[PDB]
């Protein structure tokens, strides 16, 4: 799945078809995914696999015909998106991030960051009077 | 000089578990009058 949490995978070499899987795990567990205060602050928090980001990168790399040297031999799994919703007014704030050239120490065997980081953001509005200009 | 001793074949393929692919090869003729 590249999901950073596994699925069951099997072959039954009896018939010509043989393979089967179960996606037992829908999300990686143990990630603090909602923050709230009873005053009226609340959040939806979102998280994504480095292997998935790299698949997007590799897709673009080969669209450029470039050579893959994004050396990062591990699917770390990382923050992707968050929404903050105002419990009172029902407006909200959208913020999202992306990153490229995940990086690794081939001698010390350790993480070395990303080559590039990107952020985007808008509110969402209870309001068309506000056109966002993201 | 060169003469054929033996031959074998290999097929990059996918096969059913118990699928016995069926095919055959034959020689029509050969040089050097063998």
UniProtKB/Swiss-Prot annotation, chain A:
Q: What is the deletion mutant like?
A: Cells with a disrupted yenA1-yenA2-chi2-yenB-yenC1-yenC2 locus are no longer pathogenic in C.zealandica larvae.
* Location in the cell: Secreted
Reproduce the free-text note on domains from the UniProt record: Residues 389-698 form a 5-bladed beta-propeller domain which closes one end of the shell; the other end of the shell is closed by the RHS repeat-associated core domain in YenC2.
Quaternary structure and partners: Semipurified toxin complex consists of at least YenA1-YenA2-YenB-YenC1-YenC2-Chi1-Chi2. YenB and the N-terminus of YenC2 form a large hollow shell of beta-strands. The shell is closed at both ends, within which the C-terminus of YenC2 is probably found. The Yen-TC:K9 subcomplex is about 26 nm tall and 22 nm in diameter with 5-fold symmetry and 5 copies of YenA1, YenA2, Chi1 and Chi2; the chitinase subunits may be solvent accessible on the exterior the complex. The Yen-TC:K9 subcomplex has no insecticidal activity.
Family recorded in the similarity comment: In the N-terminal section; belongs to the SpvB family.
- Role this protein plays: Part of an orally active toxin complex (TC) with strong insecticidal effects on larvae of the Coleoptera Costelytra zealandica, Acrossidius tasmania and Adoryphorus couloni and some Lepidoptera larvae. The TC has an endochitinase activity.
Query: Could you identify this protein by its name?
Result: Toxin subunit YenB
The species this protein belongs to is Yersinia entomophaga
The organism's taxonomic lineage, starting at the top: Bacteria, Pseudomonadati, Pseudomonadota, Gammaproteobacteria, Enterobacterales
Q: From which residue to which, out of the full length, is covered? A: 677 to 812 of 1487
Curated annotation (Swiss-Prot), chain B:
Protein name listed in UniProt? Toxin subunit YenA2
What does the annotation say about its assembly with partners?
A: Semipurified toxin complex consists of at least YenA1-YenA2-YenB-YenC1-YenC2-Chi1-Chi2. The Yen-TC:K9 subcomplex is about 26 nm tall and 22 nm in diameter with 5-fold symmetry and 5 copies of YenA1, YenA2, Chi1 and Chi2; the chitinase subunits may be solvent accessible on the exterior the complex. The Yen-TC:K9 subcomplex has no insecticidal activity. The native complex with additional YenB, YenC1 and YenC2 subunits is 16 nm taller and is insecticidal; the toxicity-conferring subunits are present at about 1 copy each.
Its post-translational modification remark reads: The isolated toxin complex includes 3 peptides starting between residues 768 and 778 of this protein, which might be physiologically relevant.
Phenotype upon loss of function = Cells with a disrupted yenA1-yenA2-chi2-yenB-yenC1-yenC2 locus are no longer pathogenic in C.zealandica larvae.
- Report the subcellular localization: Secreted
Residues included from the entire protein: 1219 to 1252 of 1364
Q: Which gene encodes it?
A: yenA2
Q: Which domain of life is it from?
A: Bacteria
Its biological function? Part of an orally active toxin complex (TC) with strong insecticidal effects on larvae of the Coleoptera Costelytra zealandica, Acrossidius tasmania and Adoryphorus couloni and some Lepidoptera larvae. The TC has an endochitinase activity.
């Amino acid at each position: 799945q590249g999901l950073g949490i596994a699925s069951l995978v099997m072959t039954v070499p009896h018939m010509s078809p043989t393979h089967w899987r179960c996606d037992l795990a829908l999300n990686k567990p143990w990630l603090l995914n909602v923050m709230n205060n009873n005053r009226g602050a609340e959040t939806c928090l979102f998280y994504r696999s480095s292997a998935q980001f790299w698949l997007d990168e590799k897709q673009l790399v080969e669209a450029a015909g470039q050579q893959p040297e994004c050396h990062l031999p591990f699917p770390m799994h990382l923050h992707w998106r968050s929404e903050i919703f105002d419990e009172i007014t029902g407006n909200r704030l959208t913020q999202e991030q992306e990153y490229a050239h995940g990086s690794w120490d081939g001698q010390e065997r350790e993480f070395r960051g990303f080559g590039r980081l990107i952020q985007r953001d808008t509110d969402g509005f209870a309001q068309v009077d506000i056109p966002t200009h993201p | 000089q060169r003469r054929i001793k033996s031959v074998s074949v290999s097929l990059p393929m996918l096969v059913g578990p118990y699928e016995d692919v069926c095919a055959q090869l034959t020689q029509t003729s050969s040089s050097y009058s063998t």
